């Protein structure tokens, strides 16, 4: 149907906007602390601590399969990246501090993305 195509053009346009958001968030991580999944070879206990691991590459695979239906789902994944890090790593660590910085900086980008998604529909 024509409606299904209109829908698909919107999901596609959301995906376009979310890809730009993801590029902007990832630039707030120049160290690349969040680029890839935490290695279970290098942190073998990780899944005893963290039940839903997340990372930018995993978000990107989902993005490119148009697997984010709305901005809320995307934000949930971004928040896992931050929140997992702040629980696993102590407050005095480069990792915890990197998450705090990504969170604060991400906030601005996400605040404008929400207005763009409402605004354009």
Q: How far is CA 38 from CA 22, 30, 50, in A?
A: 19, 17, 10
Determine the Cα–Cα distance for residues 119 and 117; give it in Å rounded to an integer: 6
Tokens of 59: 């978000």
* Residues 6 or more apart whose Cβ sits within 8 Å of residue 37: 53, 55, 57, 58
Residue ranges covered by each domain of the chain: 1-121
* 110 closest CA partner among 121, 102, 100, 99: 102
Q: Does domain 1-121 have CATH number 1.10.3720.10?
A: no
Contact indicator for 103, 78 with CB cutoff of 8 Å: no
Contact indicator for 52, 83 with CB cutoff of 8 Å: no
Expressed in Å, this structure's resolution amounts to 2.0
Q: How far is CA 86 from CA 72, 97, 99, 117, in A?
A: 21, 8, 7, 29
* Method in brief: X-ray
Rounded to the nearest 5 percent, the helix, strand and coil shares of the chain are: 70, 0, 30
Contact indicator for 11, 66 with CB cutoff of 8 Å: yes
The owner of tokens 């763009």 is 116
């Amino acid at each position: 149907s024509m409606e299904q195509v209109a829908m698909e053009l919107r999901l596609t346009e959301l995906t376009r906007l979310l890809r730009s958001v993801l590029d902007q968030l990832q630039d707030k991580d120049p160290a690349r602390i969040f680029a890839q999944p935490v290695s279970l070879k290098e942190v073998p206990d990780y899944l005893d601590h963290i039940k839903h691991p997340m990372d930018f590459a995993t978000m990107r695979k989902r993005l490119e399969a148009q697997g984010y239906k709305n901005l809320h789902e995307f934000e949930e994944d971004f928040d896992l990246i931050i929140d997992n890090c702040m629980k696993y790593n102590a407050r005095d660590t480069v990792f915890y501090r990197a998450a705090v910085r990504l969170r604060d900086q991400g906030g601005v980008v996400l605040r404008q993305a929400r207005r763009e998604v409402d605004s354009i529909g």
